[PDB]
Design a protein around this ligand. Structure first.
Ligand SMILES: CC(=O)N[C@@H]1[C@@H](O[C@@H]2O[C@@H](C)[C@@H](O)[C@@H](O)[C@@H]2O)[C@H](O[C@@H]2O[C@H](CO)[C@H](O)[C@H](O[C@]3(C(=O)O)C[C@H](O)[C@@H](NC(C)=O)[C@H]([C@H](O)[C@H](O)CO)O3)[C@H]2O)[C@@H](CO)O[C@@H]1O
Ligand SMILES: CC(=O)N[C@@H]1[C@@H](O[C@@H]2O[C@@H](C)[C@@H](O)[C@@H](O)[C@@H]2O)[C@H](O[C@@H]2O[C@H](CO)[C@H](O)[C@H](O[C@]3(C(=O)O)C[C@H](O)[C@@H](NC(C)=O)[C@H]([C@H](O)[C@H](O)CO)O3)[C@H]2O)[C@@H](CO)O[C@@H]1O
Lengths: 302, 299
């Protein structure tokens, strides 16, 4: 049988950045192609894009510190491995390595090392996922740091923390996919763009405000499914008995329900709403699976 | 009916620090009391200690940046809220706020702020969970930063990253949640193997080190995924022990057995301090309800 976990919004994890979900949010997404590559799974358990199941891995990188780049101080070259330690394989049926950021911007975090022996060191670092040299698909990623305290040829981890706003073209765009293969390459194996097809409906997003390290940004990061749903679908692999799972957002405090949403088989939710706005609800509220409906099932607004 | 999620070791999350599990590990635990407060859940779904269900929240802090502390350069005083935004409530039946570190050491991470408006800033920061004034139970925590670029009275978040070795990291030494002037209460109980020839099975991560010599060993009793699953399923324990088999899907054969105790920890038949390295695809599955005197085959 098909099920979804009982979770308060505040208990959900963002599938595109390793922080909790802050609020439900809906938008028209006017003139935007919504094509995130993280937090993509079908309801019958097939992972898509660069989606992995670990809730703490998205936007992390691992690899060897190859060298400091010639000519540019405290810019360091990583030769990536996959997050699981295995070599990068550009022939994988993915756009890039699992967990790789699916947005362009200055990703701010910490690069740490262990080695030689148990000697360790860690410092702030930034990775520009929009730069020409950003090519995780073939394991080539550079990070900038304000420290020169990094050892060559030692295992290096990048732990993401937030976004750094310089105030120019490299600015955080959550819907702009990076060129996973680098400047000269076209993306492939992409999870498809999503949009609402039924009149009156909009996609329901799970939004987090990720930390900012500099500049002005609300750090808005919208995922299609909380990571817990991704994990659950993967784990259960339940048969999708129709194209749409009807879900109901219920308030355990009153015992009564607030709205319904359509969970599409391909892994995204829609609601009957119009306009760009937060969907604020009683904090103990959660979704419950009600029935198998089709893509023409008609929802009351809100 | 009672189940365990199908997960490779490499897909598991540490329940005491927000990073993947690296290996299974077992220990004699000579001379130590094993009493972690995070990653504590009964197999029927009751969360204990400071355990929360969010897999990205443990060792995080949130609160108002109240002030730079007088007489102490670039040491800042937080007034905590709970990680879900709710106010800290010291009357809660917990040792401290959910997700609070359950070890003593120099916790290294990044303090970040948003405010006024959408202006942001973030810098490296350190929280000494062993210091006298570390009193998360009542919302009192300080962080040190090398930066002075922090605003007072703006929402502040501490994102943990690793451990800084110079208060040396002791994963089994519980902090004083109420600070040096109060004693801990409402602790999840210590655990130990009671049956001869058994040891606890731990899920071990090597957390990042920011400085100094450290392997960053962090041992939890259950991966966060098991905590989440038990909480969700809330299935009834039909006995004091759930017998599990760690099976290799590649061969269809069992590699070893483990006793999953009702109160939320695992033991195996083994002797000594060592990793338990197994075929990558291996995973635990429920076999049967047994008692606490069930005799396990070694390894
Ligand atoms: C990490 C770091 O040091 N990076 C700095 C930037 O400072 C960070 O971001 C700030 C927003 C702030 O949170 C700070 O604490 C961080 O360290 C720095 O960004 C400028 O910082 C200053 C200092 O507060 C101002 O916030 C400035 O914003 C404004 C301003 O001066 O009020 C806002 C104003 O709206 C804007 N004008 C217009 C029309 O947009 C002005 C104007 O652009 C500037 O005054 C012209 O210089 O800026 C932040 O832009 C940054 C620039 O100094 O350097 C590093 O990156
Ligand atoms: C962030 C920062 O700058 N912190 C430094 C420490 O350096 C960090 O840790 C280091 C291990 C290394 O990863 C470095 O890149 C980091 O920034 C610093 O720690 C000392 O660093 C030095 C310089 O590399 C040495 O590595 C020293 O290690 C040893 C050594 O000298 O080989 C290891 C040795 O095993 C140990 N002695 C024994 C017997 O255990 C000695 C010993 O501590 C000293 O010789 C004293 O008798 O050190 C690191 O200890 C730290 C101290 O300099 O200052 C900041 O913390």
């Amino acid at each position: 049988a098909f099920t979804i976990p009982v979770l308060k919004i505040s208990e959900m994890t963002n599938s595109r950045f390793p922080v909790p979900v802050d609020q439900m949010y809906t938008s028209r997404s006017e003139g935007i192609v919504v094509q995130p590559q993280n937090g993509r799974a079908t309801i019958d358990g097939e992972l898509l894009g660069t989606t992995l199941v670990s809730p703490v891995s998205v936007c992390n990188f691992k690899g060897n510190l190859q060298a400091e780049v010639p000519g540019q101080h405290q810019l360091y070259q990583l030769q990536l491995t996959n997050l699981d330690g295995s070599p990068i394989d550009p022939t994988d049926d993915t756009p890039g390595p699992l967990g790789c950021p699916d947005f362009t911007g200055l990703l701010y975090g910490v690069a740490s090392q262990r080695g030689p022996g148990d000697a360790t060191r860690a410092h702030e670092a930034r990775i520009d996922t929009g730069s020409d040299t950003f090519a995780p698909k073939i394991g080539q990623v550079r990070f900038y740091s304000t420290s020169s305290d990094f050892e060559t040829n030692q295992p290096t981890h990048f732990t993401p923390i937030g976004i750094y706003i310089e105030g120019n073209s490299s600015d955080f765009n959550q819907w702009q996919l990076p060129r996973y293969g680098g400047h000269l390459a076209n993306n492939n194996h992409l999870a498809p763009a999503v949009s609402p097809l039924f009149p009156g409906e909009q996609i329901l997003f799970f939004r987090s405000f990720i930390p900012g390290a500099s500049g002005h940004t609300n750090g808005e990061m919208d995922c299609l499914l909380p990571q817990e749903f991704v994990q659950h679908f993967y784990q259960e692999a339940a048969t999708a008995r129709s194209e749409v799972a009807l879900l109901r957002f219920v308030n355990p405090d009153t015992g009564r329900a607030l709205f319904e949403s359509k969970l599409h088989k391909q892994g995204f939710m829609t609601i009957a709403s119009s306009g760009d706005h937060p969907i604020i609800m009683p904090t103990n509220g959660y979704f419950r699976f009600e029935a198998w409906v089709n893509q023409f099932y008609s929802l009351a607004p809100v």
